[PDB]
Amino acid sequence: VFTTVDNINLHTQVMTYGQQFGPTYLDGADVTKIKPHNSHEGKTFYVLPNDDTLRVEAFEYYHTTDPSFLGRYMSALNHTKKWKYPQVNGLTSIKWADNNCYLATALLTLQQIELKFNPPALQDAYYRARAGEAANFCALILAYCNKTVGELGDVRETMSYLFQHANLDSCKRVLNVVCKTCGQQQTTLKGVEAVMYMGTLSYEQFKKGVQIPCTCGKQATKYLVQQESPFVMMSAPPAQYELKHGTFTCASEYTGNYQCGHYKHITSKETLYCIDGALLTKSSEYKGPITDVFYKENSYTTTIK
Ligand SMILES: C=CC(=O)Nc1ccc(C)c(C(=O)N[C@H](C)c2cccc3ccccc23)c1
Ligand SMILES: [Cl-]
Ligand SMILES: [Cl-]
Numbered sequence: 169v170f171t172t173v174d175n176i177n178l179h180t181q182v183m184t185y186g187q188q189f190g191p192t193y194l195d196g197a198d199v200t201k202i203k204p205h206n207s208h209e210g211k212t213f214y215v216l217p218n219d220d221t222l223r224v225e226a227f228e229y230y231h232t233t234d235p236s237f238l239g240r241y242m243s244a245l246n247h248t249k250k251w252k253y254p255q256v257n258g259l260t261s262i263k264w265a266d267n268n269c270y271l272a273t274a275l276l277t278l279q280q281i282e283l284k285f286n287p288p289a290l291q292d293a294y295y296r297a298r299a300g301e302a303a304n305f306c307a308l309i310l311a312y313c314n315k316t317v318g319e320l321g322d323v324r325e326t327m328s329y330l331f332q333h334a335n336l337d338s339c340k341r342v343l344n345v346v347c348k349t350c351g352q353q354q355t356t357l358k359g360v361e362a363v364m365y366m367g368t369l370s371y372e373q374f375k376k377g378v379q380i381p382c383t384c385g386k387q388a389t390k391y392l393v394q395q396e397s398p399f400v401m402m403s404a405p406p407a408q409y410e411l412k413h414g415t416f417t418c419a420s421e422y423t424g425n426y427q428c429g430h431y432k433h434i435t436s437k438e439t440l441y442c443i444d445g446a447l448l449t450k451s452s453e454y455k456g457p458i459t460d461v462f463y464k465e466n467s468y469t470t471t472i473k
């Protein structure tokens with residue numbers, strides 16, 4: 169048979185699996201204690217890294233040394249394999265199961281923004297997800313986010329974790345802070361901090377300025393001087409918000425109470441589409457509880473001296 173950690177580098181091997189190889193998985197399902205059948209023969213098994221060659225191969229494919237990672241990934245995959253991934257409005261969604269609404273919203277969002285994942289495991293799975301086969305990609309999202317199946321998930325926290333595994337180095341955000349007393353200070357943010365803001369949904373309002381505390385004691389004004397990124401994510405606690413066709417890429421709708429409510433996805437095409445897992449409605453106007461709005465960007469410089 170063949171052992172692997174990445175399903176690229178295959179090593180030939182020939183008493184339980186757990187005694188010979190340590191924790192040994194097949195197609196999601198733990199076969200550590202279980203024995204070697206005759207149709208459990210010739211195929212490819214995943215193993216926990218137990219020698220240097222496999223640790224290096226594991227880090228090179230996943231970008232983590234965390235020894236739980238593989239087990240958390242296989243426990244997720246055992247469920248995500250059984251979910252349905254229908255095409256909805258030319259996007260791979262997920263049918264509702266095991267509290268996955270937040271994952272579906274993230275997955276739909278990731279198909280509409282420009283992102284390169286550093287870990288080969290994630291990039292490969294992203295491409296396969298975009299082409300309709302998203303089980304692997306969803307298991308990896310759960311593992312990288314330290315979330316298990318059924319656990320209550322936040323889209324902003326999931327996007328934040330995923331962004332930290334993505335090539336956002338070229339992304340730059342210059343902010344000016346204007347206080348009556350302390351005066352003007354400019355800050356350069358890079359990477360994840362350049363593409364994410366919590367406090368308002370409106371990219372327009374971020375450019376025009378928002379009111380934040382100053383250390384001195386007063387209320388100051390933060391405004392956007394310069395943005396170099398393919399997109400920005402604007403987030404705020406759920407609040408009734410109007411979404412206008414053509415002024416945003418997509419948005420997370422969040423209904424109900426902290427943690428135990430539900431997400432739906434709004435996307436701006438030729439009209440506004442609402443994706444609720446397998447279900448698709450459309451309308452020209454939208455007002456509802458929004459918590460995330462994604463916008464297109466390349467290069468922005470303010471006309472405020
Ligand atoms: C840190 C621990 C944690 O478990 N976080 C987490 C996990 C899972 C979920 C669904 C949420 C969450 O309900 N997020 C929504 C969008 C939300 C965000 C911020 C402020 C809010 C105010 C009122 C209602 C919703 C609010 C947060
Ligand atoms: Cl890394
Ligand atoms: Cl299941």
Ligand SMILES: [Cl-]
Nearest residue numbers: 264267268269
């Ligand atoms: Cl759900």
Ligand SMILES: [Cl-]
Nearest residue numbers: 231286287333
């Ligand atoms: Cl990474």
Ligand SMILES: [Zn+2]
Nearest residue numbers: 231286287333
């Ligand atoms: Zn990395």
Ligand SMILES: [Zn+2]
Nearest residue numbers: 247248266317
């Ligand atoms: Zn399940």
Ligand SMILES: [Zn+2]
Nearest residue numbers: 267269430431
């Ligand atoms: Zn849900």
Ligand SMILES: [Zn+2]
Nearest residue numbers: 347350382384
């Ligand atoms: Zn001040």
